Structure formats: structure tokens, C-alpha cells
Write a protein that binds this ligand. Structure first.
Ligand SMILES: O=c1c(O)c(-c2ccc(O)c(O)c2)oc2cc(O)cc(O)c12
Length: 299
């Protein structure tokens, strides 16, 4: 029993984190085989042209430190918004890995790092506006987000910068930004967010599985009539695919998805009136159906 914001064990990723120093900038890099990946804005600099700036760089400008052993850069290249530093040593601790891009609403673990040394791990969700509400201080650029499947690390996020509202923006590991953001000094701001409906529903199911049932009712809505109240409260539309994905949770609790939707509709119209769900007085939207199954069945 119990439900917590659970990150993946971080050990496979800890052994890939290095410090990259160039100019007066120090940030974090991801060392896999003989390549170190880091944000390109580490390059020594109003509206930088990074292809130009990278031409003016030499391999010896980049200081890479794995713990205490220093790594010598033998080549360098740009890959969209990340820099790839070729080094003369393949990382003996390179895990089985792949680079995947995630979808808004999906979750990952974040290994917050400073000067190449890991400092903490937490669970994040890609917000529908392609930001993440992380916890990041100066020096944390290059910290990575990841999921683990069996023994394979799926890297999905490299941190690049904090937006004025205090939320965070980064790239996938091929250097492509999540959302309409750029690694140059703009007045760019996060766009309006919405609540991930399918996640709230999965968390309602987690609550039922854990004995919280005070919000249940006998009523059942239809997809169309639920999506109309969703729109009013700034909730993402719910699709038939979402209902199918919720099927296993439906089965295990014996509550149909559209039944649980009627209860969600009630929680939006009325409040909770001083009650809580899973220790929360808010509707929680950063647990996917997959995370619930993992924590409420097999981990
Ligand atoms: O976080 C940000 C940041 O660091 C800087 C920046 C740019 C050039 C520099 O030479 C520098 O030292 C800092 O630009 C930004 C521009 C944005 O639109 C949003 C941001 O969040 C940042």
C-alpha cells in the first residue's frame, strides 16, 4: 500500500555524469561510450550563431572531468542544441541506453547534477506546454531525464534553462527542444498549461486501490459530455485511446472509466470539501497509467 512520487533508481545514470568546463562556464555532461553530450550554450560567446562560435573552438578548450580522472577531447561536433564531445575513453560504466523523445503528459526521472556530481533524483512530467516544473539551481544544465525499462536507460531530457515563471525547458538527447523555446536570451515565456486528464484518472484509480473511495458515485457520464466539462476547467480532452489505456485499472478496481469520469466531473464542480485523496487536497496529474500499474502492482 501507499502511493509516492517514485523516481527510477539512478545508479546507471550516475556513472555517466561528468563535468564539462569551457571558458568560464561549467555544466554537466552525459558520457556514453566515447562521446560526452552537453548543452551547446557552454560554447564561449546578442543572438549567438552557434555554428560560427563552435568553429572558433579547439579540442583543448573543453575540459571534461569524470570524477577526478580528466578526459581529453579528441573531436567535437554540434547536434542541434547539444554539443557532442568525442573523448579518448569509452565510459566503462556505459549502460544499455537509447535516446527517446517523450510526449506531453508522460513522466521521467530527473537526476539533478552540479559539477558532474549527482545531487538528487525526482519524478517529473512533461507539461502539455512542453515545460517541466523541476527543481534546478545554477549549475544544473546538462542534468538528464530518463526512464528505465528492464535494464535499458531511455534518456529523454537534457536540461537547458529556466523560464521567467520558474519552470524549466530542455531538449531531447538529439538536441531538439521540447516546445517553442530556444537557447538564446529572448523574452520567451511558457504558454498556457492544461491539466493532463488521463493522468488524473489514473491517480483516482490509484486512490481506489489504496482505500480512498469517498469521491466515487453511481453516476456514469459519456465521453462527449465529459469532454465539455473538461474544456471548462482547462483539462485536456479525453480520447478513446485514453479509455483503452485505463482498461487494466478499470478491470482491477471494477470501476468503468466513464464511471470514474462522472466522479471526476463531481470533483471539478464541487470541491473536495475538506477531504483529501492520497494525501493530496488537489487533483494530481503527474502519474501516468503506467506509473500507477508499476507502483500498485509490480515494481
Ligand atoms: O535562462 C536564460 C539564460 O541563462 C539566458 C542567457 C542568454 C545568454 C547569455 O550569454 C547568458 O549568460 C544567459 O537567456 C534566456 C533567454 C530566455 O528567453 C529564457 C531564459 O530562461 C534564459
Amino acid at each position: 500500500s501507499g502511493f509516492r512520487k517514485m523516481a527510477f533508481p539512478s545508479g546507471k545514470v550516475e556513472g555517466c555524469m561528468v563535468q564539462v568546463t569551457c571558458g568560464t562556464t561549467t555544466l554537466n555532461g552525459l558520457w556514453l561510450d566515447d562521446v560526452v553530450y552537453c548543452p551547446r550554450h557552454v560554447i564561449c560567446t546578442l543572438n549567438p550563431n552557434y555554428e560560427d562560435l563552435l568553429i572558433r573552438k579547439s579540442n583543448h578548450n573543453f575540459l571534461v572531468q569524470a570524477g577526478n580522472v580528466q578526459l581529453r577531447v579528441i573531436g567535437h561536433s554540434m547536434q542541434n542544441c547539444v554539443l557532442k564531445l568525442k573523448v579518448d575513453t569509452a565510459n566503462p560504466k556505459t549502460p544499455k541506453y537509447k535516446f527517446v523523445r517523450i510526449q506531453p503528459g508522460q513522466t521521467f526521472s530527473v537526476l539533478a547534477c552540479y559539477n558532474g556530481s549527482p545531487s538528487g533524483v525526482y519524478q517529473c512530467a512533461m507539461r502539455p506546454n512542453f515545460t517541466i516544473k523541476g527543481s534546478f539551481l545554477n549549475g544544473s544544465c546538462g542534468s538528464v531525464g530518463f526512464n528505465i525499462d528492464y535494464d535499458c536507460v531511455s534518456f529523454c531530457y537534457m536540461h537547458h534553462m529556466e523560464l521567467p515563471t520558474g519552470v524549466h525547458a530542455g531538449t531531447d538527447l538529439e538536441g531538439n527542444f521540447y516546445g517553442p523555446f530556444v537557447d538564446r536570451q529572448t523574452a520567451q515565456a511558457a504558454g498556457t498549461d492544461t491539466t493532463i486528464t488521463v493522468n488524473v484518472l489514473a491517480w483516482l484509480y490509484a486512490a481506489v486501490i489504496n482505500g480512498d473511495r469517498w469521491f466515487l458515485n453511481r453516476f456514469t457520464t459519456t465521453l462527449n459530455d465529459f469532454n465539455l466539462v473538461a474544456m471548462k476547467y482547462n483539462y485536456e480532452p479525453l480520447t478513446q485511446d485514453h479509455v483503452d489505456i485505463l482498461g487494466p485499472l478499470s478491470a482491477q478496481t471494477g470501476i468503468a472509466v466513464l464511471d470514474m469520469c462522472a466522479s471526476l466531473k463531481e470533483l471539478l464542480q464541487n470541491g473536495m470539501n475538506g477531504r483529501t485523496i492520497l494525501g493530496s487536497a488537489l487533483l494530481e496529474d503527474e502519474f501516468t497509467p503506467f506509473d500507477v500499474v508499476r507502483q500498485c502492482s509490480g515494481v
